[PDB]
């Protein structure tokens, strides 16, 4: 119904931190997945965009809360924690201690310090209707073959081929003067077919005669010999 | 604080359709799910049911499936319950029930409203 | 859906002492549990919920443990504004079919 994507950096030794049924220190007090999440844990490696040969003063981790957060909770509030009879009513003193600090990523730093953009795919599984679209979807073109075609409502089965006709932008479908469909028009790469009826006929076995011989031929009348010894 | 105000005595016919209102206070509500649940008279709560703040990404329950609807909106932040063909079995109480968790999961209730004594009969 | 389903369904008990209710079910349902508390004459309160941990505002009294298909509640004493009645619900992953019990009723011995 409705997949709500959350995109947040962290750093490179806390990719499998956060996973469902995980005590973490940037697990537990931060972007929580609780037991329950039926998303992915997508992510891929930013030692590149991320990467600045600066302090890093724009990335943080988020360690001094006062409790536990709850799942998927974004906290807003900037106030200065205070760890225990010591209130802060202005500046942060000696027990008190800052929310945010600067993460630095160093170009230089191996593995496990790297900038590393992780994404989790929430998936809500509300029982619901999948909103405005379902399937709609579509194959690749074999072509050249009699098989089953379904382009856009049009059911049954020919050899699909390539036809030189150019049909006015406004017409999909295409017919003749017996009711037919002979050509039509690739939804996808708005280019024109034909469709040709399958390879039929009829099957006469000549027979000399029981009494002479047994051997028989078979004609396949209305096939050049490709479509299934002399 | 988180108080959730609901409406008070309403009375219907049978074969109508009652529009019961839960208004929000406190939280934002773009971000806790909320549930409409039935206390009957002596008995307990009998069919669950999410309401989506944000769109219209409902789930109804398995009892009804179909004679109710769950609308939203953000204007004023109140929810809706409109149950259609009331009989003899549907007088009871409802309550608006939030959640702790977010709109992704859903854990229990923890916020409770009030109550509307829904009857039926002259 | 999981019929949870109580066996007691009355526990008539004294004030101070220690309280055992149980709700158990069919399926697994050691860490999807939630344990409400509905007094009369107004709305049902959350009393534990994940059934692993506490909720908030809940006195150090209320102690809820248990795993498997076998769940009770752990009263540590009971007092005069603690007589209601107590429910069970799972939390279902994927079906959202959230049902509930009968409930049990506190009683006191006079």
């Known amino acids: 119904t409705n997949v709500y994507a959350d995109s947040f950096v962290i750093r490179g030794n806390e990719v499998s931190q956060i996973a469902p049924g995980q005590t973490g220190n940037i697990a537990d007090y931060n972007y929580k997945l609780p037991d329950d999440f039926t998303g992915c844990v997508i992510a891929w490696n930013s030692n590149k965009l991320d990467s600045k040969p600066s302090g890093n003063y724009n990335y943080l981790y988020r360690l001094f809360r006062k409790s536990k957060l709850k799942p998927f909770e974004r906290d807003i509030s900037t106030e200065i924690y205070q760890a225990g009879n010591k209130p802060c009513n202005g500046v942060a003193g000696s027990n008190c201690y800052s929310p945010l600090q600067s993460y630095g990523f160093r170009p230089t730093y191996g593995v496990g310090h790297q900038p590393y953009r992780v994404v989790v795919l929430s998936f809500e599984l509300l029982h619901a209707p999948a909103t405005v679209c379902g399937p709609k979807k579509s194959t690749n073109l074999v072509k050249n073959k009699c098989v089953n075609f379904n382009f856009n409502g049009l059911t049954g089965t020919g050899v699909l081929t390539e036809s030189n006709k150019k049909f006015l932008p406004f017409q999909q479908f295409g017919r003749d003067i017996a009711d037919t469909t002979d050509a039509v028009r690739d939804p996808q790469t708005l280019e024109i077919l034909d469709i040709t009826p399958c390879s039929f006929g009829g099957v006469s076995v000549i027979t000399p005669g029981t009494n002479t011989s047994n051997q028989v031929a078979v004609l396949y009348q209305g096939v050049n010999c490709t479509e299934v010894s002399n | 604080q988180v108080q959730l105000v609901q409406s008070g005595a309403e009375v219907k016919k049978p074969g109508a359709s009652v529009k019961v209102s839960c208004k929000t206070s406190?939280?934002?509500?773009?971000?806790?799910?909320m549930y409409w649940v039935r206390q009957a008279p002596g008995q307990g709560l009998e069919w669950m049911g999410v309401?989506?703040?944000?769109?219209?990404?409902?789930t109804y329950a398995q009892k009804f499936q179909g004679r109710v609807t769950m609308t939203s909106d953000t204007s004023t932040s109140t929810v809706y319950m409109e149950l259609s063909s009331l009989r003899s079995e549907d007088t009871a109480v409802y309550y608006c029930?939030?959640?702790?968790?977010?709109?992704?999961?859903?854990?229990?209730?923890?916020?409770w409203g009030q109550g509307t004594l829904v009857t039926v009969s002259s | 859906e999981i019929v949870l389903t109580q066996s007691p369904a009355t526990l008539s008990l004294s004030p101070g002492e220690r309280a055992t209710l149980s709700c158990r079910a069919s399926q697994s349902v050691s860490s999807y549990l939630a344990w409400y508390q509905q007094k009369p004459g107004q709305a049902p309160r959350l009393l534990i919920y994940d059934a692993t941990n506490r909720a908030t505002g809940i006195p150090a009294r209320f102690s809820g443990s248990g795993s498997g298909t076998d769940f009770t509640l752990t009263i540590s004493s009971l007092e005069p504004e603690d007589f209601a009645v107590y429910y069970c619900?799972?939390?279902?992953?994927?079906?959202?079919?959230?049902?509930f019990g009968q409930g049990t009723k506190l009683e006191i011995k006079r």
């Open positions: 619900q799972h939390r279902s992953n994927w079906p959202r079919m959230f049902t």
């Open positions: 309401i989506n703040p944000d769109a219209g990404s409902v």
């Open positions: 406190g939280y934002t509500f773009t971000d806790h799910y």
């Open positions: 029930a939030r959640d702790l968790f977010f709109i992704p999961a859903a854990n229990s209730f923890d916020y």
